[PDB]
Design a protein around this ligand. Structure first.
Ligand SMILES: COc1ccc(Br)cc1-c1nc(N)nc2[nH]cnc12
Ligand SMILES: [Br-]
Length: 113
């Protein structure tokens, strides 16, 4: 794997630690979540992201972070705010936005000098 793949794997591992029950580990099915495919146009989950890293499909942290954002946004769209899934998505979203912030990335870049 390349350094960018390893960095994204790092971020993904840290984010998945925030989902110990594995609700974001694989695609949400309509059996699990009635009507989901009628509401959510562009599904995403951590497993799909892992596959995209392995398939070398992300060129940048920006592209990875967009998939991560989509995953949380989907959960916060389908599910109401009082639900397990909405609250967990929000928790993960905030963790990821901090982890992959411009300031965090600048700190990493400084150390790569
Ligand atoms: C794969 O998802 C699940 C797995 C097991 C169980 Br029980 C629930 C979900 C799930 N349910 C809903 N309503 N919204 C989600 N957003 C992300 N996960 C989910
Ligand atoms: Br719930």
């Amino acid at each position: 794997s390349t350094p960018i793949q390893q960095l994204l794997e790092h971020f993904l591992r840290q984010l998945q630690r925030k989902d110990p029950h594995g609700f974001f580990a694989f695609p949400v099915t309509d059996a699990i979540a009635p009507g989901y495919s009628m509401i959510i146009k562009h599904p995403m989950d951590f497993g799909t992201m892992k596959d995209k890293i392995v398939a070398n499909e992300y060129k940048s942290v920006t592209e990875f972070k967009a998939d991560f954002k989509l995953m949380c946004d989907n959960a916060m769209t389908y599910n109401r705010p009082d639900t397990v899934y909405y609250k967990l998505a929000k928790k993960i979203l905030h963790a990821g936005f901090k982890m992959m912030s411009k300031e965090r990335l600048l700190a990493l870049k400084r150390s790569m000098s």
